[PDB]
Coordinates of C-alpha atoms and ligand atoms in Angstrom, one line a residue:
Chain A
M1 CA 31.2 14.3 8.2
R2 CA 28.0 15.0 6.3
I3 CA 26.7 11.8 4.6
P4 CA 25.1 9.2 6.9
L5 CA 26.0 5.5 6.3
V6 CA 23.9 2.5 7.2
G7 CA 25.8 0.6 10.0
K8 CA 28.9 2.9 9.9
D9 CA 29.9 6.4 10.9
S10 CA 29.0 9.4 8.7
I11 CA 31.7 10.4 6.2
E12 CA 32.7 13.5 4.4
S13 CA 31.8 13.7 0.8
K14 CA 35.4 13.5 -0.4
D15 CA 35.5 9.9 0.8
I16 CA 32.5 8.6 -1.2
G17 CA 34.7 7.1 -3.9
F18 CA 33.4 5.1 -6.9
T19 CA 29.6 5.2 -6.4
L20 CA 26.6 3.4 -8.0
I21 CA 24.0 6.1 -7.5
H22 CA 20.8 3.9 -8.0
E23 CA 20.6 0.2 -7.0
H24 CA 18.1 -1.8 -4.9
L25 CA 19.1 -4.5 -2.4
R26 CA 15.5 -5.7 -2.1
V27 CA 12.0 -4.5 -3.3
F28 CA 8.6 -5.6 -2.1
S29 CA 5.0 -4.3 -1.5
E30 CA 4.6 -3.7 2.2
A31 CA 1.0 -4.7 2.4
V32 CA 1.5 -8.0 0.5
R33 CA 4.5 -9.1 2.5
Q34 CA 2.6 -8.4 5.8
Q35 CA -0.6 -10.2 4.8
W36 CA 1.0 -13.2 3.0
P37 CA 4.5 -14.0 4.4
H38 CA 4.5 -17.4 2.6
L39 CA 5.3 -15.7 -0.7
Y40 CA 8.7 -14.5 0.5
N41 CA 12.0 -16.1 1.6
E42 CA 14.3 -14.0 3.9
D43 CA 17.3 -16.2 3.5
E44 CA 17.3 -16.4 -0.3
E45 CA 16.9 -12.6 -0.5
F46 CA 19.8 -11.9 1.9
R47 CA 22.3 -14.2 0.1
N48 CA 21.3 -12.8 -3.3
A49 CA 21.9 -9.3 -2.2
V50 CA 25.2 -10.2 -0.5
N51 CA 26.4 -12.1 -3.6
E52 CA 25.6 -9.1 -5.9
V53 CA 27.3 -6.5 -3.7
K54 CA 30.5 -8.4 -3.2
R55 CA 30.9 -8.8 -7.0
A56 CA 30.4 -5.1 -7.5
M57 CA 33.1 -4.5 -4.9
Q58 CA 35.5 -6.8 -6.9
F59 CA 35.1 -4.2 -9.7
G60 CA 36.0 -1.3 -7.3
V61 CA 32.6 0.0 -6.2
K62 CA 32.9 1.6 -2.8
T63 CA 29.4 3.2 -2.2
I64 CA 25.9 2.2 -3.2
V65 CA 23.0 4.6 -3.0
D66 CA 19.8 2.7 -2.4
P67 CA 16.6 4.7 -3.1
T68 CA 14.1 2.1 -1.7
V69 CA 11.4 3.9 0.3
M70 CA 7.8 3.7 1.4
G71 CA 5.9 1.7 -1.2
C72 CA 8.9 -0.5 -2.1
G73 CA 9.8 -2.2 1.2
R74 CA 12.6 -0.2 2.8
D75 CA 13.9 -2.3 5.7
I76 CA 16.6 -0.5 7.6
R77 CA 17.5 -3.7 9.6
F78 CA 17.9 -5.9 6.5
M79 CA 20.3 -3.2 5.0
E80 CA 22.6 -3.1 8.0
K81 CA 22.8 -6.9 7.9
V82 CA 24.1 -6.7 4.3
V83 CA 26.5 -4.0 5.3
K84 CA 28.0 -6.1 8.1
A85 CA 28.4 -9.0 5.7
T86 CA 30.2 -7.0 3.0
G87 CA 31.6 -3.6 4.3
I88 CA 30.0 -1.6 1.4
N89 CA 29.2 2.1 2.0
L90 CA 25.4 2.2 1.8
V91 CA 23.3 5.4 1.7
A92 CA 19.7 5.0 2.6
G93 CA 16.9 7.4 2.0
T94 CA 13.4 8.6 3.0
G95 CA 10.5 9.6 0.8
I96 CA 7.2 8.1 -0.7
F97 CA 7.0 6.1 -3.9
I98 CA 3.5 6.6 -5.4
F99 CA 2.2 6.9 -9.0
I100 CA -1.4 8.0 -8.2
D101 CA -2.7 8.4 -4.7
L102 CA -1.3 8.3 -1.2
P103 CA -2.3 5.6 1.3
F104 CA -5.5 6.2 3.2
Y105 CA -3.6 7.4 6.3
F106 CA -3.0 10.7 4.4
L107 CA -6.6 11.8 3.8
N108 CA -7.0 15.3 5.2
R109 CA -3.3 15.6 6.0
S110 CA -1.2 18.6 5.1
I111 CA 2.0 18.8 3.0
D112 CA 3.7 19.8 6.3
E113 CA 2.6 16.5 8.0
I114 CA 4.3 14.5 5.2
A115 CA 7.5 16.6 5.2
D116 CA 7.7 16.0 8.9
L117 CA 7.9 12.2 8.2
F118 CA 11.0 12.8 5.9
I119 CA 12.6 15.2 8.5
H120 CA 12.1 12.6 11.3
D121 CA 14.0 10.0 9.2
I122 CA 16.8 12.5 8.4
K123 CA 17.2 14.0 11.9
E124 CA 16.3 11.1 14.3
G125 CA 16.5 7.9 12.3
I126 CA 14.7 5.2 10.3
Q127 CA 12.2 2.8 11.7
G128 CA 13.3 3.2 15.4
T129 CA 16.9 2.9 14.4
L130 CA 19.6 5.6 14.6
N131 CA 20.6 5.1 10.9
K132 CA 19.6 8.3 9.3
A133 CA 18.4 9.2 5.8
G134 CA 20.8 10.9 3.4
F135 CA 18.4 11.9 0.6
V136 CA 14.7 12.2 -0.2
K137 CA 13.2 9.9 -3.1
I138 CA 10.0 10.9 -5.0
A139 CA 8.2 9.5 -8.0
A140 CA 5.9 10.1 -10.9
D141 CA 5.1 7.9 -13.9
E142 CA 2.5 7.4 -16.6
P143 CA -0.3 9.0 -14.5
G144 CA 1.5 12.4 -14.7
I145 CA 1.7 14.9 -11.8
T146 CA -1.5 14.0 -9.9
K147 CA -2.6 16.0 -6.8
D148 CA -1.0 13.6 -4.4
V149 CA 2.1 13.2 -6.5
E150 CA 2.4 17.0 -6.3
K151 CA 1.9 16.9 -2.5
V152 CA 4.9 14.5 -2.2
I153 CA 7.2 16.7 -4.4
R154 CA 6.4 19.8 -2.4
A155 CA 7.0 17.8 0.8
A156 CA 10.5 16.9 -0.5
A157 CA 11.3 20.5 -1.0
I158 CA 10.4 21.4 2.6
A159 CA 12.7 18.6 3.9
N160 CA 15.5 19.8 1.7
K161 CA 15.1 23.4 2.7
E162 CA 15.3 22.3 6.4
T163 CA 18.0 19.6 6.1
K164 CA 20.0 20.2 2.9
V165 CA 19.9 16.5 1.8
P166 CA 19.6 16.2 -2.1
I167 CA 16.6 14.7 -4.0
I168 CA 16.5 11.7 -6.3
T169 CA 13.5 11.2 -8.5
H170 CA 11.7 8.5 -10.5
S171 CA 10.2 9.8 -13.7
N172 CA 8.8 8.4 -17.0
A173 CA 11.2 9.4 -19.7
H174 CA 8.5 9.9 -22.4
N175 CA 5.8 12.0 -20.7
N176 CA 7.6 15.2 -19.3
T177 CA 7.2 14.2 -15.6
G178 CA 11.0 14.7 -15.2
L179 CA 10.8 18.3 -16.4
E180 CA 7.8 19.0 -14.2
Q181 CA 9.4 17.6 -11.0
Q182 CA 12.4 19.9 -11.7
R183 CA 10.1 22.9 -12.3
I184 CA 8.1 22.3 -9.1
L185 CA 11.2 21.6 -6.9
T186 CA 13.0 24.7 -8.2
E187 CA 10.0 27.0 -8.0
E188 CA 9.9 26.1 -4.3
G189 CA 13.6 27.2 -3.9
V190 CA 15.6 24.0 -4.2
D191 CA 19.1 24.2 -5.8
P192 CA 18.8 22.4 -9.2
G193 CA 22.3 20.9 -8.5
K194 CA 20.7 19.0 -5.6
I195 CA 18.3 17.1 -7.9
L196 CA 18.9 13.9 -9.8
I197 CA 16.1 13.5 -12.3
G198 CA 15.8 9.7 -12.9
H199 CA 15.3 7.2 -15.7
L200 CA 16.2 9.7 -18.5
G201 CA 18.3 6.9 -19.9
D202 CA 15.1 5.3 -21.0
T203 CA 15.0 7.6 -24.1
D204 CA 17.1 8.5 -27.1
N205 CA 15.4 11.9 -27.4
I206 CA 18.7 13.9 -26.8
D207 CA 16.7 17.1 -26.9
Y208 CA 14.6 16.4 -23.9
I209 CA 17.5 15.0 -21.8
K210 CA 19.6 18.2 -22.6
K211 CA 16.8 20.6 -21.7
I212 CA 16.7 19.1 -18.2
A213 CA 20.5 19.2 -17.8
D214 CA 20.6 22.8 -19.1
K215 CA 18.3 23.8 -16.3
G216 CA 21.0 22.7 -13.8
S217 CA 20.2 19.2 -12.5
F218 CA 21.8 15.8 -12.8
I219 CA 20.4 13.4 -15.4
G220 CA 19.9 9.7 -14.5
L221 CA 21.3 7.4 -17.1
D222 CA 20.5 4.8 -14.5
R223 CA 18.7 1.7 -16.0
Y224 CA 21.5 -0.1 -17.9
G225 CA 20.4 -3.6 -18.7
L226 CA 16.6 -3.1 -18.4
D227 CA 16.1 -3.7 -22.2
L228 CA 12.3 -3.4 -22.0
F229 CA 12.8 0.4 -21.5
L230 CA 15.8 0.8 -23.9
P231 CA 18.4 -1.7 -25.2
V232 CA 22.0 -1.3 -24.1
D233 CA 23.4 -0.5 -27.5
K234 CA 21.0 2.4 -27.8
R235 CA 21.7 3.7 -24.3
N236 CA 25.4 3.5 -25.1
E237 CA 25.3 5.8 -28.1
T238 CA 23.2 8.3 -26.2
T239 CA 25.7 8.3 -23.4
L240 CA 28.5 8.7 -26.0
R241 CA 26.6 11.6 -27.7
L242 CA 26.0 13.4 -24.4
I243 CA 29.7 13.1 -23.4
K244 CA 31.0 14.4 -26.8
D245 CA 28.6 17.4 -26.5
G246 CA 30.2 18.3 -23.1
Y247 CA 27.5 17.1 -20.6
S248 CA 29.7 14.9 -18.4
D249 CA 29.2 17.6 -15.7
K250 CA 25.6 16.3 -15.3
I251 CA 25.7 12.6 -16.2
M252 CA 25.2 9.9 -13.6
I253 CA 25.1 6.2 -14.5
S254 CA 23.6 3.1 -12.7
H255 CA 21.5 0.0 -13.3
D256 CA 18.4 0.2 -11.1
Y257 CA 19.1 -3.5 -10.3
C258 CA 17.0 -5.4 -7.7
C259 CA 18.8 -8.2 -6.0
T260 CA 15.2 -9.3 -5.4
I261 CA 12.0 -7.8 -6.6
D262 CA 8.5 -9.3 -5.9
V263 CA 6.8 -7.7 -8.9
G264 CA 5.2 -10.2 -11.4
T265 CA 6.8 -8.5 -14.4
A266 CA 10.2 -9.4 -13.0
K267 CA 9.7 -13.2 -13.0
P268 CA 12.7 -15.4 -14.1
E269 CA 10.5 -16.7 -16.9
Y270 CA 10.7 -13.2 -18.5
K271 CA 14.4 -12.5 -17.9
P272 CA 15.8 -13.7 -21.3
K273 CA 13.9 -11.2 -23.3
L274 CA 13.2 -8.3 -21.0
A275 CA 16.6 -7.9 -19.1
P276 CA 19.2 -10.6 -20.0
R277 CA 22.5 -9.1 -18.8
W278 CA 21.0 -6.9 -16.1
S279 CA 23.0 -6.8 -12.8
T280 CA 25.1 -4.3 -10.8
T281 CA 28.3 -4.9 -12.9
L282 CA 27.0 -4.7 -16.5
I283 CA 28.6 -1.2 -17.0
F284 CA 32.0 -2.7 -16.2
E285 CA 31.4 -5.5 -18.8
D286 CA 30.0 -3.3 -21.5
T287 CA 29.5 0.5 -21.2
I288 CA 32.8 1.7 -19.9
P289 CA 34.8 -0.5 -22.3
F290 CA 32.5 0.7 -25.1
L291 CA 33.2 4.4 -24.2
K292 CA 37.0 4.0 -24.0
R293 CA 37.4 2.4 -27.3
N294 CA 35.3 5.3 -28.5
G295 CA 37.8 7.9 -27.4
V296 CA 36.4 8.7 -23.9
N297 CA 39.4 9.0 -21.6
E298 CA 39.6 7.9 -18.0
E299 CA 39.3 11.4 -16.6
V300 CA 35.7 11.5 -17.8
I301 CA 34.9 8.1 -16.2
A302 CA 36.2 9.5 -12.9
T303 CA 34.1 12.6 -13.2
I304 CA 30.8 10.6 -13.8
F305 CA 31.3 7.9 -11.1
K306 CA 33.3 9.9 -8.5
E307 CA 33.3 13.7 -8.9
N308 CA 29.6 14.0 -9.7
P309 CA 28.3 11.9 -6.7
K310 CA 30.7 13.9 -4.5
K311 CA 29.1 17.2 -5.7
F312 CA 25.5 15.8 -5.4
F313 CA 26.2 15.1 -1.7
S314 CA 28.2 18.3 -0.9
Chain B
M1 CA -18.5 -26.5 12.7
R2 CA -18.3 -24.6 9.5
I3 CA -17.4 -21.2 11.0
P4 CA -13.7 -20.8 12.2
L5 CA -13.0 -18.3 15.0
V6 CA -9.9 -16.5 16.2
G7 CA -8.3 -18.0 19.2
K8 CA -11.1 -20.6 19.6
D9 CA -12.4 -23.8 18.1
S10 CA -14.9 -23.5 15.3
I11 CA -18.7 -23.5 15.9
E12 CA -21.8 -24.5 14.0
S13 CA -23.5 -21.6 12.4
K14 CA -26.7 -22.2 14.5
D15 CA -24.6 -21.3 17.6
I16 CA -23.5 -17.8 16.4
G17 CA -26.2 -16.0 18.5
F18 CA -26.5 -12.2 18.6
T19 CA -24.1 -10.9 15.9
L20 CA -22.5 -7.6 14.9
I21 CA -21.8 -8.3 11.2
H22 CA -19.4 -5.4 10.4
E23 CA -17.0 -3.9 13.0
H24 CA -13.2 -3.2 13.1
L25 CA -10.9 -3.8 16.0
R26 CA -8.1 -1.8 14.3
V27 CA -7.5 -0.1 10.9
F28 CA -4.2 1.2 9.6
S29 CA -2.1 1.5 6.4
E30 CA 0.4 -1.3 6.1
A31 CA 3.1 0.7 4.4
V32 CA 2.8 3.7 6.8
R33 CA 3.0 1.6 10.0
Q34 CA 5.9 -0.3 8.6
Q35 CA 7.9 2.8 7.6
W36 CA 7.0 5.3 10.5
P37 CA 6.3 3.1 13.6
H38 CA 6.6 6.3 15.7
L39 CA 3.1 7.3 14.6
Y40 CA 1.4 4.3 16.3
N41 CA 0.9 3.1 19.9
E42 CA 0.3 -0.6 20.3
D43 CA -0.7 -0.5 24.0
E44 CA -3.3 2.2 23.6
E45 CA -4.8 0.4 20.5
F46 CA -5.0 -2.9 22.5
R47 CA -6.8 -1.1 25.4
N48 CA -9.3 0.7 23.1
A49 CA -10.2 -2.6 21.5
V50 CA -10.7 -4.6 24.8
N51 CA -12.9 -1.8 26.2
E52 CA -15.3 -1.5 23.2
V53 CA -15.7 -5.2 22.8
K54 CA -16.4 -5.6 26.6
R55 CA -19.1 -2.9 26.2
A56 CA -20.8 -4.7 23.3
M57 CA -20.8 -8.0 25.3
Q58 CA -22.5 -6.1 28.1
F59 CA -25.5 -5.6 25.8
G60 CA -25.5 -9.2 24.7
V61 CA -23.4 -9.4 21.5
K62 CA -22.0 -12.9 21.2
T63 CA -20.1 -12.6 17.9
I64 CA -18.3 -9.9 16.0
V65 CA -17.4 -10.2 12.3
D66 CA -14.4 -8.1 11.6
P67 CA -13.8 -7.5 7.8
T68 CA -10.3 -5.9 8.1
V69 CA -8.1 -7.2 5.3
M70 CA -5.1 -6.3 3.1
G71 CA -5.0 -2.6 2.7
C72 CA -6.6 -2.0 6.1
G73 CA -4.0 -3.6 8.4
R74 CA -5.4 -7.0 9.3
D75 CA -3.2 -8.5 12.1
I76 CA -4.3 -11.9 13.4
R77 CA -2.0 -12.0 16.4
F78 CA -3.5 -8.7 17.6
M79 CA -7.1 -10.1 17.0
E80 CA -6.3 -13.2 19.1
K81 CA -4.9 -11.1 22.0
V82 CA -8.2 -9.2 22.1
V83 CA -10.1 -12.5 22.0
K84 CA -8.2 -14.0 25.0
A85 CA -8.8 -10.8 27.0
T86 CA -12.5 -10.7 26.4
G87 CA -13.9 -14.1 25.3
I88 CA -15.7 -12.8 22.2
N89 CA -16.5 -15.0 19.2
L90 CA -14.5 -13.2 16.4
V91 CA -14.7 -14.0 12.7
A92 CA -11.7 -12.9 10.6
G93 CA -11.6 -13.0 6.8
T94 CA -9.4 -12.7 3.7
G95 CA -9.5 -10.3 0.8
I96 CA -8.1 -7.1 -0.8
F97 CA -9.4 -3.6 0.0
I98 CA -8.6 -1.2 -2.9
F99 CA -10.4 1.5 -4.7
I100 CA -8.2 1.9 -7.8
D101 CA -5.2 -0.2 -8.5
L102 CA -3.4 -3.1 -6.9
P103 CA 0.0 -2.9 -5.2
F104 CA 2.9 -3.3 -7.7
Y105 CA 3.4 -7.0 -6.7
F106 CA 0.4 -7.9 -8.7
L107 CA 1.5 -6.5 -12.1
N108 CA 1.4 -9.4 -14.7
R109 CA -0.3 -11.7 -12.1
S110 CA -3.5 -13.4 -13.0
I111 CA -6.9 -13.6 -11.2
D112 CA -6.0 -17.2 -10.3
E113 CA -2.9 -16.2 -8.4
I114 CA -5.1 -13.8 -6.5
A115 CA -7.7 -16.4 -5.6
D116 CA -4.9 -18.7 -4.5
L117 CA -4.0 -16.2 -1.7
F118 CA -7.6 -16.1 -0.4
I119 CA -7.8 -19.9 -0.5
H120 CA -4.4 -20.2 1.4
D121 CA -6.0 -18.0 4.1
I122 CA -9.2 -20.1 4.2
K123 CA -7.7 -23.6 4.0
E124 CA -4.3 -23.3 5.7
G125 CA -4.5 -20.2 7.8
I126 CA -3.6 -16.5 8.2
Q127 CA -0.2 -14.9 8.5
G128 CA 1.4 -18.2 9.4
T129 CA -1.1 -19.2 12.1
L130 CA -3.9 -21.9 12.1
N131 CA -6.6 -19.2 12.4
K132 CA -8.6 -19.5 9.2
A133 CA -10.7 -17.0 7.3
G134 CA -14.4 -17.4 7.2
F135 CA -15.3 -15.1 4.3
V136 CA -13.8 -13.0 1.6
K137 CA -14.0 -8.9 1.7
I138 CA -13.8 -6.9 -1.5
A139 CA -14.3 -3.1 -2.0
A140 CA -15.2 -0.5 -4.6
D141 CA -16.0 3.2 -4.0
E142 CA -15.9 6.5 -5.8
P143 CA -13.6 5.5 -8.7
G144 CA -16.1 2.9 -9.7
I145 CA -15.5 -0.6 -11.2
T146 CA -11.9 -0.1 -12.4
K147 CA -9.8 -2.8 -14.0
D148 CA -8.1 -4.0 -10.9
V149 CA -11.2 -3.8 -8.8
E150 CA -12.9 -6.1 -11.2
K151 CA -10.0 -8.6 -10.9
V152 CA -10.5 -8.8 -7.1
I153 CA -14.2 -9.4 -7.5
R154 CA -13.7 -12.4 -9.9
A155 CA -10.9 -13.7 -7.6
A156 CA -13.4 -13.7 -4.7
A157 CA -15.9 -15.6 -6.9
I158 CA -13.2 -18.3 -7.6
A159 CA -12.5 -18.6 -3.8
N160 CA -16.2 -19.0 -3.1
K161 CA -16.4 -21.8 -5.7
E162 CA -13.6 -23.8 -4.1
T163 CA -14.4 -23.2 -0.4
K164 CA -18.0 -22.0 0.0
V165 CA -17.3 -19.1 2.4
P166 CA -19.5 -16.0 1.8
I167 CA -18.5 -12.6 0.5
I168 CA -18.8 -9.2 2.2
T169 CA -18.4 -6.0 0.1
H170 CA -17.7 -2.4 0.6
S171 CA -19.5 -0.2 -1.8
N172 CA -20.5 3.5 -2.3
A173 CA -24.3 3.9 -2.0
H174 CA -24.6 6.6 -4.8
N175 CA -22.4 4.9 -7.4
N176 CA -24.3 1.7 -8.4
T177 CA -21.0 0.0 -7.4
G178 CA -23.0 -2.3 -5.1
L179 CA -25.2 -3.4 -7.9
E180 CA -22.2 -4.0 -10.2
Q181 CA -20.6 -6.2 -7.6
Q182 CA -23.7 -8.4 -7.2
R183 CA -24.1 -8.6 -11.0
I184 CA -20.5 -9.7 -11.6
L185 CA -20.3 -12.2 -8.8
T186 CA -23.6 -13.8 -9.8
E187 CA -22.5 -14.0 -13.4
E188 CA -19.5 -16.0 -12.3
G189 CA -21.8 -18.4 -10.4
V190 CA -21.9 -17.2 -6.8
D191 CA -25.2 -17.9 -4.9
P192 CA -26.7 -14.4 -4.4
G193 CA -27.7 -15.5 -0.9
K194 CA -24.0 -15.7 0.0
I195 CA -23.3 -12.0 -0.7
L196 CA -23.7 -9.0 1.6
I197 CA -23.7 -5.7 -0.2
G198 CA -22.2 -3.2 2.1
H199 CA -22.9 0.4 3.1
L200 CA -26.3 0.6 1.4
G201 CA -27.5 2.3 4.7
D202 CA -25.6 5.4 3.5
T203 CA -28.6 6.3 1.2
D204 CA -32.3 6.9 1.7
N205 CA -33.1 5.9 -1.9
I206 CA -35.1 2.7 -1.1
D207 CA -35.7 1.6 -4.7
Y208 CA -31.9 1.1 -5.2
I209 CA -31.7 -0.9 -1.9
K210 CA -34.7 -3.1 -2.8
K211 CA -33.2 -3.7 -6.2
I212 CA -30.1 -5.5 -4.7
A213 CA -32.2 -7.4 -2.1
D214 CA -34.8 -8.4 -4.7
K215 CA -32.1 -10.2 -6.7
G216 CA -31.3 -12.4 -3.6
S217 CA -28.5 -10.6 -1.6
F218 CA -28.4 -9.3 1.9
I219 CA -28.2 -5.5 2.3
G220 CA -25.9 -3.8 4.8
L221 CA -27.4 -1.1 6.9
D222 CA -24.1 -1.1 8.6
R223 CA -22.8 2.4 9.3
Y224 CA -25.0 3.5 12.2
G225 CA -23.4 6.5 13.9
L226 CA -21.3 7.8 10.9
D227 CA -23.5 10.8 10.5
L228 CA -21.4 12.3 7.6
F229 CA -22.7 9.5 5.4
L230 CA -26.2 9.8 6.8
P231 CA -27.7 10.9 10.2
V232 CA -29.2 8.3 12.5
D233 CA -32.7 9.7 12.1
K234 CA -32.8 9.1 8.3
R235 CA -31.3 5.6 8.8
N236 CA -34.0 4.6 11.2
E237 CA -36.8 5.8 8.7
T238 CA -35.2 3.8 5.9
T239 CA -34.7 0.7 8.0
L240 CA -38.3 0.8 9.2
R241 CA -39.7 1.4 5.7
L242 CA -37.8 -1.7 4.5
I243 CA -39.0 -3.9 7.3
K244 CA -42.6 -2.7 6.9
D245 CA -42.4 -3.9 3.3
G246 CA -41.2 -7.5 4.0
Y247 CA -37.4 -7.1 3.5
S248 CA -36.5 -8.1 7.1
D249 CA -35.2 -11.4 5.8
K250 CA -32.5 -9.5 3.9
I251 CA -31.5 -6.8 6.4
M252 CA -28.2 -6.8 8.4
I253 CA -27.3 -4.0 10.8
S254 CA -24.0 -2.9 12.3
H255 CA -21.9 0.3 13.0
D256 CA -18.6 -0.1 11.0
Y257 CA -17.0 1.1 14.3
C258 CA -13.2 1.5 14.2
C259 CA -11.8 1.2 17.8
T260 CA -8.7 2.9 16.4
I261 CA -8.3 4.2 12.8
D262 CA -5.2 6.0 11.6
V263 CA -6.7 8.0 8.6
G264 CA -6.6 11.8 9.2
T265 CA -10.3 12.1 8.4
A266 CA -11.0 10.2 11.7
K267 CA -8.8 12.2 14.0
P268 CA -10.6 13.0 17.3
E269 CA -11.1 16.8 16.7
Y270 CA -13.5 15.8 13.9
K271 CA -15.7 13.5 16.0
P272 CA -18.3 16.1 17.4
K273 CA -19.8 16.8 14.0
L274 CA -18.8 13.8 11.9
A275 CA -19.7 10.9 14.3
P276 CA -20.7 12.0 17.8
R277 CA -22.5 8.8 19.1
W278 CA -20.5 6.3 16.9
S279 CA -19.7 3.1 18.8
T280 CA -20.4 -0.6 18.9
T281 CA -23.4 0.0 21.2
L282 CA -25.3 2.9 19.5
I283 CA -28.0 0.5 18.2
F284 CA -28.9 -0.6 21.7
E285 CA -29.5 3.0 22.8
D286 CA -31.3 4.4 19.7
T287 CA -32.0 2.1 16.7
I288 CA -33.5 -1.0 18.4
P289 CA -35.8 1.0 20.8
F290 CA -36.9 3.1 17.8
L291 CA -37.9 0.0 15.9
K292 CA -39.8 -1.5 18.8
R293 CA -41.8 1.6 19.5
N294 CA -42.8 1.6 15.8
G295 CA -44.4 -1.8 15.6
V296 CA -41.4 -4.1 15.0
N297 CA -41.7 -7.0 17.4
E298 CA -38.8 -9.0 19.0
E299 CA -39.1 -11.8 16.4
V300 CA -38.1 -9.4 13.7
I301 CA -35.2 -8.2 15.8
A302 CA -34.0 -11.8 16.3
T303 CA -34.3 -12.4 12.5
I304 CA -32.0 -9.5 11.8
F305 CA -29.3 -10.1 14.5
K306 CA -29.4 -13.9 14.8
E307 CA -31.3 -15.6 12.0
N308 CA -29.7 -13.6 9.2
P309 CA -26.0 -14.0 10.3
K310 CA -26.8 -17.7 10.7
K311 CA -28.2 -18.1 7.1
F312 CA -25.3 -16.1 5.6
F313 CA -22.7 -18.3 7.1
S314 CA -24.6 -21.6 6.4
Ligands
LIG401 CO1 12.6 4.3 -10.3
LIG402 CO1 -16.3 -0.3 4.2
LIG403 FE1 14.7 2.3 -8.5
LIG404 FE1 -15.6 -1.6 7.4

């Protein structure tokens, strides 16, 4: 019994089953929600997330990994409410989601102070609860590896060395931050097989994607349906190409869907053009039927959505 | 009764009395307190706040203006507990305190949606209470007038137009950021006499200070006791030189004291050499006696601590 579950007992990795490795029940800015509660609706958010999870379960999904952490509104109590309503296996995480600078709390604070916050969440529990974190989540985007972004990466390595949970990342697919996160994490002694470099499905540069996978880490083909980053047809033929070239040992697939997100870019006005078919079940409606009538047999699908998450968490 | 107060009925500006224009009951990072509650202690914070305010009332302070807003952990229920335990007149505000970028919630959101939040706090109330904001707080520091900093400035100008509350600023004394804020706000139509340009007391360069005051705005000599910005001795010389030259009608004086502050810079082991005598009552022991034994009579003292707060809030 290694992997902690929100609102359930920890399970052994052989029981994870068909997993969606990267999906968000709810996303918000902590400071904004605290200071202006009138902009949010708890009841509409709960019922949206319940409705999305149940439909993914009708397609056979057993476990959702939810990498919502500090900076994006991680609420451990909301999550265990959604678990009770649906019965999904739900893995929560710890970490810090920043692109530039840490919050003011962290001025004059060591990398060890930050890693201790991740270890508290893993070993004791999240937000005063006994639900424990099952991975660490870190991020870098267009601003590159800044000094505080580097501090967070090095803090994740300390927490993994001490607890053995794996690491999921957010990177920008067109600026090498994915390769850099992998380089810093492995220089500091993390097993590359415990790193999922994220948002690599945002590019059709097969060479860049393959260079990360050849250094031993999982590649996140994890934003199916966010057309503004890359359209579905283009992601599909990249997934096909990687599978034909033999890379199914490192492929993980998901949607990065947010059953609610408070960001202004994700208004319903903009949905028709930026992300029309985006949801937690799009891969069942499109990608997997696309792969199979393109010669990919069901043993490969099992590897990607079951065997690979099992190894990540083993 | 144009000034609203926390936990009390509003008062006419002529009844504000002896005022400390810039002090903080509590400062923390919204995301950190939300994600790691084990780092904070609500009972100790409450007690530290009650004791400092009681001490300021001992010396005759009637009114405290607390410019804690989003980004610095404003909590109106906490402020109203302190009020009921002490009897102080406490003015809370609205605003956004950032140095670089806004939280992700604001991406693809206009200046008008930002002004709308300030106005909600002024006209309807704060955090779901009927305590209303009496001014708008904005900040800029070392990174200068960035894109998102400029947005918040203009948003504060629009809230001023609709509601007439004044504007307090945080600036860096060696950046010209204080001069930029005054230029931008006055270009969008704000009465220069409703603007307090903050943290000018951190410098001894009197030509820059007189520059902002000459163009009609109050000047904040508001960090008495934070020696790392400037020792008390130099602050007294600058304050006297300004009064001796007729700028008493523009001077406001305070400490920027934080009864509790969570940033690592302010941890207690740093206090002996960063801010030894920092408190809400340092000016009663040092600064006010200094001024009186150098030719400043009680009418000028009353101008700075009673007449100027009154005119600012009129
Ligand atoms: Co991401
Ligand atoms: Co300030
Ligand atoms: Fe995500
Ligand atoms: Fe302040």
